[model samples]
Target: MVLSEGEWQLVLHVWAKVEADVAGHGQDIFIRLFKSHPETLEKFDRFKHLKTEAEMKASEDLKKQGVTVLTALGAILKKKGHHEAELKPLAQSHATKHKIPIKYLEFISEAIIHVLHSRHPGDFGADAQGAMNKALELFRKDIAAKYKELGYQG
Candidate 1:
């Protein structure tokens, strides 16, 4: 899924808005995730006890976890898919330590797209959605490849 220059620009433009409010935006992303796939919460022992988005939002630990994701994503988005150095280790950790399946990763991508569209309804047009989807697809592939390289069965 190759993105045009215009598509990249659109993705970056929307991402800028997300980056501006990482704390809020990150929490929202997680909230959407929990809402859509409650089963995923079991992957995180700390979050497993959380039964609802409101509880997850109120927990400082959960908030920090969300921040970790947003921070890493910010770096990846900045590099424009040139984040193998950072992503490789992350992918390995998720695959090995966290035991996150590819399906959960896919869920997160969908949640992010949902958040962006909901927050910026007018700005998140079809082209913008396509760009985000492409970017996330590339990110997912990189993670999967790195996971395989690490000899993980995931």
Candidate 2:
């Protein structure tokens, strides 16, 4: 997904949240998007419900991944050496199971994140946004690497 800089900023914001905040921010962002772009409401509604369930399940299975990534990000910011423990694996499962390419995942992450960041700047700060951005990058790179390593053609 080709996202504008502002949109990317939003993506970072959503990624920086704790699990509970992620859900709340996601819901609010969905509502705001529906209100702003009524024509997209149908698609939004369907995705919102399905995505909510998917994300919840993903989170349950990936909270450790999230924490690991965030912890490493925090450590990095504190000038610590790189650590592999923060690498997220749930994204690859999502890609494989749902037939969602890295492009679509990037789009979803960026769009949702953008809405939340725009709506609630106070909640997500520069640090959180920066960390989330890096996290998304990690996910993107990981998926790409897996595609190559696993010989995924599509």
Best-matching candidate per TM-score: 1
Q: List the residue pairs that clash in candidate 2.
A: 10-113, 10-114
lDDT of 2 by residue, 36-127 (tens): 44444343323444334346345432344334434433443232112233333443444455454566545645655576467657765775
Local distance difference test scores for all models:
0.86, 0.48
Please give the distance, in angstroms, between residue 91's alpha carbon in candidate 1 and its true position after superposition. 1.2
TM-score of each: 0.94, 0.45
lDDT of 1 by residue, 1-154 (tens): 4567787798899988887888888889988998899888889888888876678879898888888999998788778767878897798789889999888999999999999999988879998898889989988888888888888747
Q: Specify the poorest-scoring 10-residue window by lDDT in model 2.
A: 76-85
Candidate 2's clash total is 2
